[PDB]
Enzyme design. Structure first.
Site, mmCIF file in Angstrom:
data_model
loop_
_atom_site.group_PDB
_atom_site.id
_atom_site.type_symbol
_atom_site.label_atom_id
_atom_site.label_comp_id
_atom_site.label_asym_id
_atom_site.label_seq_id
_atom_site.Cartn_x
_atom_site.Cartn_y
_atom_site.Cartn_z
ATOM 1 N N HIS C 5 81.099 -18.398 104.905
ATOM 2 C CA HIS C 5 81.624 -18.785 103.605
ATOM 3 C C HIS C 5 82.776 -19.536 103.616
ATOM 4 O O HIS C 5 83.123 -20.548 103.022
ATOM 5 C CB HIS C 5 81.399 -17.759 102.574
ATOM 6 C CG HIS C 5 79.897 -17.299 102.424
ATOM 7 N ND1 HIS C 5 79.304 -16.451 103.053
ATOM 8 C CD2 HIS C 5 78.938 -17.875 101.583
ATOM 9 C CE1 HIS C 5 78.116 -15.926 102.837
ATOM 10 N NE2 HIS C 5 78.027 -17.194 101.483
ATOM 11 N N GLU C 77 84.509 -11.469 105.778
ATOM 12 C CA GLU C 77 84.690 -12.581 106.613
ATOM 13 C C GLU C 77 86.029 -12.782 107.197
ATOM 14 O O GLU C 77 86.415 -12.918 108.265
ATOM 15 C CB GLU C 77 84.145 -13.860 106.154
ATOM 16 C CG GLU C 77 82.650 -13.677 105.869
ATOM 17 C CD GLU C 77 82.271 -15.149 105.200
ATOM 18 O OE1 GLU C 77 80.654 -15.109 105.380
ATOM 19 O OE2 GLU C 77 82.784 -16.019 105.258
ATOM 20 N N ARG C 165 83.430 -5.133 75.051
ATOM 21 C CA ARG C 165 83.984 -5.763 74.183
ATOM 22 C C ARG C 165 82.624 -6.241 73.161
ATOM 23 O O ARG C 165 81.620 -6.397 73.690
ATOM 24 C CB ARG C 165 84.380 -7.315 74.881
ATOM 25 C CG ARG C 165 85.557 -7.265 75.456
ATOM 26 C CD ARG C 165 85.829 -8.560 76.222
ATOM 27 N NE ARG C 165 87.376 -8.687 76.500
ATOM 28 C CZ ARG C 165 88.019 -8.062 77.436
ATOM 29 N NH1 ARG C 165 87.533 -7.563 78.365
ATOM 30 N NH2 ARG C 165 89.460 -8.319 77.610
ATOM 31 N N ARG C 220 94.310 -3.922 74.776
ATOM 32 C CA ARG C 220 92.695 -3.717 74.230
ATOM 33 C C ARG C 220 92.944 -2.650 73.111
ATOM 34 O O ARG C 220 92.012 -2.449 72.340
ATOM 35 C CB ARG C 220 91.606 -3.219 75.325
ATOM 36 C CG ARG C 220 91.387 -4.314 76.082
ATOM 37 C CD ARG C 220 90.668 -5.485 75.706
ATOM 38 N NE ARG C 220 89.507 -5.016 74.828
ATOM 39 C CZ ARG C 220 88.347 -4.496 75.581
ATOM 40 N NH1 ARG C 220 88.244 -4.338 76.594
ATOM 41 N NH2 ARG C 220 87.252 -4.094 74.470
HETATM 42 O O1 LIG Z 1 73.762 -21.524 96.409
HETATM 43 P P1 LIG Z 1 73.940 -20.562 95.622
HETATM 44 O O2 LIG Z 1 73.185 -20.855 94.313
HETATM 45 O O3 LIG Z 1 75.054 -19.728 95.222
HETATM 46 O O4 LIG Z 1 72.533 -19.353 95.943
HETATM 47 C C1 LIG Z 1 72.819 -18.299 96.942
HETATM 48 O O5 LIG Z 1 73.692 -18.206 97.989
HETATM 49 C C2 LIG Z 1 74.849 -17.490 98.054
HETATM 50 C C3 LIG Z 1 75.509 -16.943 99.505
HETATM 51 O O6 LIG Z 1 75.238 -17.987 100.530
HETATM 52 C C4 LIG Z 1 74.627 -16.763 97.089
HETATM 53 O O7 LIG Z 1 75.442 -16.918 95.920
HETATM 54 C C5 LIG Z 1 72.966 -16.930 96.674
HETATM 55 O O8 LIG Z 1 72.391 -16.546 95.776
HETATM 56 O O1 LIG Z 2 88.984 -8.049 83.598
HETATM 57 C C1 LIG Z 2 90.031 -8.183 83.074
HETATM 58 N N1 LIG Z 2 90.885 -9.319 83.425
HETATM 59 C C2 LIG Z 2 91.782 -9.658 82.256
HETATM 60 C C3 LIG Z 2 91.945 -9.276 81.197
HETATM 61 F F1 LIG Z 2 92.742 -9.510 80.370
HETATM 62 C C4 LIG Z 2 90.688 -8.171 81.126
HETATM 63 O O2 LIG Z 2 90.932 -7.698 79.918
HETATM 64 N N2 LIG Z 2 89.722 -7.842 81.692
#
Ligand SMILES: O=P(O)(O)O[C@H]1O[C@H](CO)[C@@H](O)[C@H]1O
Ligand SMILES: O=c1[nH]cc(F)c(=O)[nH]1
Ligand SMILES: O=P(O)(O)O[C@H]1O[C@H](CO)[C@@H](O)[C@H]1O
Ligand SMILES: O=P(O)(O)O[C@H]1O[C@H](CO)[C@@H](O)[C@H]1O
Ligand SMILES: O=P(O)(O)O[C@H]1O[C@H](CO)[C@@H](O)[C@H]1O
Ligand SMILES: O=P(O)(O)O[C@H]1O[C@H](CO)[C@@H](O)[C@H]1O
Ligand SMILES: O=c1[nH]cc(F)c(=O)[nH]1
Ligand SMILES: O=c1[nH]cc(F)c(=O)[nH]1
Ligand SMILES: O=c1[nH]cc(F)c(=O)[nH]1
Ligand SMILES: O=c1[nH]cc(F)c(=O)[nH]1
Ligand SMILES: [K+]
Ligand SMILES: [K+]
Ligand SMILES: [K+]
Lengths: 250, 246, 250, 246, 250, 250
Positions: C5, C77, C165, C220
């Protein structure tokens, strides 16, 4: 008998690979009656089996009784005998205000509120219906006229507390299920019944095709317990649809 | 901006109610370019959004990034903007030996090996795709003549241990996922991907229609790590399916 | 490319063993600029990777994206390429009334409200930070005079329902998370974020060192959606802390 | 009809507070006939109900069907109609080498491998039998001279995978139940059956008394196989126990 | 010494196969003194062990301490030494209004609100008492005319939140246990204590016979904390019963 | 007495806000004797309490007994009496080959294989030690030269099946725990003990500071039962460190 419970041999099926599977043993004969050459094969416990003929092809009607356990027995043993397609025809209580008594519901997939499905696949596995069976039920319903709804169904090992009924011996519901009906409602769930989670999970995880249709005999935003006066009419309506669906699945 | 992450307004959608949601932000321009009057709206983080038109109706294409969490942000915020139909187009690795590279997989429902789905509905709820969406994906696949498999997908929050890959830094898989590929294989599960359990569950539990179609880039019965006329085929299908759903 | 990736080779890293891992790809360039000889290596999907120098030794800055899933891909990775130490720098929503916007939060361990951590260790395993990393982050904060809080963080696979939320499309929250913010609050949890449970768990269970620091952009106990104009002086205060901790860890 | 499934009025019972509950509707008439003034009340689905008379007092015989679900309907609706003691009677197959065919198993409590029990109490709640009922059953078996075992029973929602049967269509058992029978055997569990977890849990959590007794017709561990005598032996025991509990 | 915690050899037992196992080490001499030839065997940690004779047969009295964990140590190690029958005698808090302080409660089975029981059997296994031991306890109680109740007991790994006590340092209870006393009350649960789930599960899962009796020192329908002055005589009522039951099981 | 179990009043403590909490009552006098002005306060069940003085400030030493449950009682009731800092000192079996008998282990967080922690927070909550107590224990270990390891600890409600011992009466380990030791070992877990999951969980969720340290009395890659002829050498090493850590936390 080739199997432990149903009292059936492979010969009795005469090459059938499709079974209509209602919950009620008394419904089996009614379903076979809409087809040709209806013949009673056996009856042991809650399992009553007939064979009939649909467009010249042998078809099985076999009751499951109430619940996943006996459903799991019927499906397993039918599968040993060669059935590969399973269509449940049932009765159900709707939990949505727009779904009326007499309406026909086709279940795409089920909320697993049972134990038997876990004996085939862990909870994360979707109790999903086979696409061709589901397609057959929806097209069947359209062609005979019914007002139909297509969606998720909650499938419960109880009739009373798991469907949040409070008019009962004890008047109470265990914490896990308190407020549960309202939550399924907000999540778009259509109805409650008792066998589909087991049926759908055990078929989808073993390469068998399964579908599910039920007739609405009560709406839970009005009453807990169904009225008797319209139950019979609704039953024949769903039965007509399941038989027609079987026809497009041969 | 009317939403916290996507960088979009209700206005920008121009009345769009359907969004095609790929995982890769770089794939969004490619998908939109198959439609009429394509236009980049925004990109912040992993969310790249374009607007196009399909049969004279406005349509959104918006990336989700990898995983249920970013997916869940994109779906929610698009829904606040008026999107009611989400069609996922993905890449995937098949786990069944009869499924060849090239093939297309329309997902009816998902094994929930993820966390985000549980933030919308308890595990017992099925990660099931909308029936009209699935119908339209199957019919679109039949229209361009791809060989198609219809069934269950395993949707995992990891690329590696959750899909039982052993060729890793640690080389081991936690007990829960040990032997898991084999079990899903025998249960007739077609493939592994990473967003559908979240997408399908959150949509099925909030009155939103969702469907999933993916092109196969590798078969796991040969390799672990992944003829690109196939990502092309799947994009052609999701667009044609979107047309039937508008 | 040696991994699937990130689009990186072992050679690209030049023997780097420490990576700072922000969530936002557009932050990567900014963090690499506090260091020497910043160069872009690769950019695929939500994974932007730069390399810089700190006291003469190579260092990676690599975005994870939002969520444990893309975070699990980046950490694995990078680990295949030789990274042994991982310092997350984030933004966060505090849920304690005494913690202010601009404050810096160092995470000792995380409440596992994610899915991916389970792919590495069962729930009972603590999503705990490495002791040296935490030490270096706490001491860095003290050395630039930031107002710092040190404790537990809640790490959620969702931005919306899992952080309770309600200002959403559906307006509702699943039973499991209804009342949850108040529980975490009463248990002394400092904040919500979305990646730390996965990072910390996958690292602590595989011999890798990890630490977490974040700047508070909202509180929050008066707001759901953060204010727009305090995400600049805060973001940069926390970036300086993680770069200075990186120095103490080489 | 006062109740939805069983087709019974409170008056049909004539003040009965004790029900003997077999599984097979076709056995209801036979057990009824062992007592005075047997009369059929109804039959619907798998619920066949007869009333009888035991030492001058009215007693119910009512089939549950197979499984916890239908059992839970019978028990609930009988309770509405005034039944406070349920005695389960059945035949079964042991999983211990020392338990022989012809022997009688009285169940103190059950391993809850079912779904319905959970609808009455969380899993930590013990599926325990009532001490008075259990005592009456043990004393009843002793007084006719049966060879008896008293212990734990595993209660499964399936006949096949949950009792680790592999002679099936699929020929496989899901991970969770793989190795389970060996564990239950090592834990002293006497047998499998399919209703007692639901019956004992729902009764013990609602102030109702329940017990169970069963004849052993088959044994999984044993070879070679035998083979009616054992059915009527366990029935004589439940009827004699009902006698002591009136 | 043959076991790691109790400081005992098989020979110290002198062929004993039955132990009475109270929670409190100071109570052990009290129980031994009701029998013949009482001799102290050992005392390490919370495990105090005395030997005595009952109708001419050697019998062990050994404390478990509070909790399933240390209970599991004493039972395991006494089992290695040849003990086959364990009778727990404890103190307890009634949660039903008809149960009195001074009453004797015999447990048929326990609600497993503990951790140690899981280390012997999965949660679905019933923490059920041995039928012979329970029978002996009931009949012993009937023979001295003590007012007795027989039923289900909730066995909690804590004294405070697991038994839904709010008069505490924090004054709160985690959501899992909020409203839990009420649910157990409605389900006919007689009482709370802390060791029975562990004892009954490990014993039933390993072919060892176990029984559980306890004296009530507080009723939770009126107050959280037991009073001082009446605990001494409640102790003497269930101690007479547990010794007499021991006689019937030799 | 202001508390039900420990038999102590607020005035017995004389303003003390820190307690050292060994498992073994017989070890309490040992530990107090390293400090100034040691005096027994009380002894009830497995809870033996001494008070001493450390650089002019009063300090408590109080045994927990074995296990989360009794641990939960001692911490709750000490907290009612004014204790805000808890340092556990224990013995432990090391599960890594490089960790020797005689080594000191400081726990950053614990795997929750207990029941009591769930009575304070759901499983997802990390049983994390306080950063200040951990820092002080590690620096205290450094200042006296002890060979020290810092990391995760597995904390079990049993000594036997939960720590995967097979040299037992039954000779089996339940499915859930079979192969578990090898997996904790692969995940970098250092050791097994029985109280820290509860201690750390209950303290971190109620605003109390807790630290955990222990001497290694056996290595599990070689042996199940600890050998008594090397235990008193290792006990007095860890005791030294906890007292020195307490000095730094006053
Ligand atoms: O090519 P996309 O739509 O990301 O789909 C697929 O491949 C990714 C991993 O290589 C995961 O995100 C999986 O669901
Ligand atoms: O996951 C979060 N990221 C940043 C934020 F402000 C929050 O409330 N929650
Ligand atoms: O009428 P049938 O097919 O039994 O269907 C439904 O109704 C029964 C309960 O009344 C359950 O079996 C339920 O699923
Ligand atoms: O700003 P980053 O580092 O992504 O951190 C945090 O904020 C995001 C949500 O806005 C989540 O990714 C969360 O954990
Ligand atoms: O008095 P003992 O026998 O210990 O019994 C009971 O009371 C203790 C707590 O007060 C727990 O041990 C409980 O089970
Ligand atoms: O020596 P202590 O402090 O009791 O510590 C440890 O050893 C005991 C078991 O021998 C458990 O209490 C364990 O955690
Ligand atoms: O399981 C059910 N069957 C039939 C019904 F009408 C209902 O509400 N529930
Ligand atoms: O999640 C996945 N995405 C893409 C793939 F090719 C694969 O195998 N798994
Ligand atoms: O565990 C308990 N022991 C004694 C009691 F009085 C009580 O309420 N709980
Ligand atoms: O809990 C434990 N205490 C002491 C030990 F040596 C051990 O292995 N386990
Ligand atoms: K992402
Ligand atoms: K049935
Ligand atoms: K103890």
């Amino acid at each position: 008998s080739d199997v432990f419970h149903l009292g059936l041999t492979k010969n009795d099926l005469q090459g059938a690979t499709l079974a209509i599977v209602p919950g009620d043993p008394d419904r089996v004969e009614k379903i076979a009656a809409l087809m040709d050459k209806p013949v009673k094969l056996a009856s042991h416990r809650e399992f009553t089996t007939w064979r009939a003929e649909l467009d010249g092809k042998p078809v099985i009607v076999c009751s499951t009784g109430i619940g996943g356990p006996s459903t799991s027995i019927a499906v397993e043993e039918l599968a040993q005998l060669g059935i590969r397609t399973f269509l449940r025809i049932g009765t159900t209580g709707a939990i949505q205000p727009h779904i009326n008594v007499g309406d026909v519901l086709v279940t795409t997939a089920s909320v697993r509120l049972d134990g038997a499905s876990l004996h085939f696949a862990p909870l994360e596995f979707p109790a999903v219906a086979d696409f061709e069976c589901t397609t057959a039920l929806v097209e069947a319903a359209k062609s005979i006229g019914a007002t139909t709804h297509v969606g998720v169904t909650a499938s419960s090992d109880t009739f009373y507390p798991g469907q949040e009924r409070y008019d009962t011996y004890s008047g109470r519901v265990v914490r896990h299920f308190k407020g549960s009906m309202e939550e399924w409602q907000a999540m778009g769930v259509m109805n409650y019944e008792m066998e589909s989670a087991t049926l759908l999970t055990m078929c989808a995880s073993q390469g068998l095709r399964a579908g599910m249709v039920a007739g609405v005999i009560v709406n839970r935003t009005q009453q807990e317990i169904p009225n008797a006066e319209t139950m019979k009419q609704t039953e024949s309506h769903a039965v007509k649809i399941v038989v027609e669906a079987a026809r497009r699945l041969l």
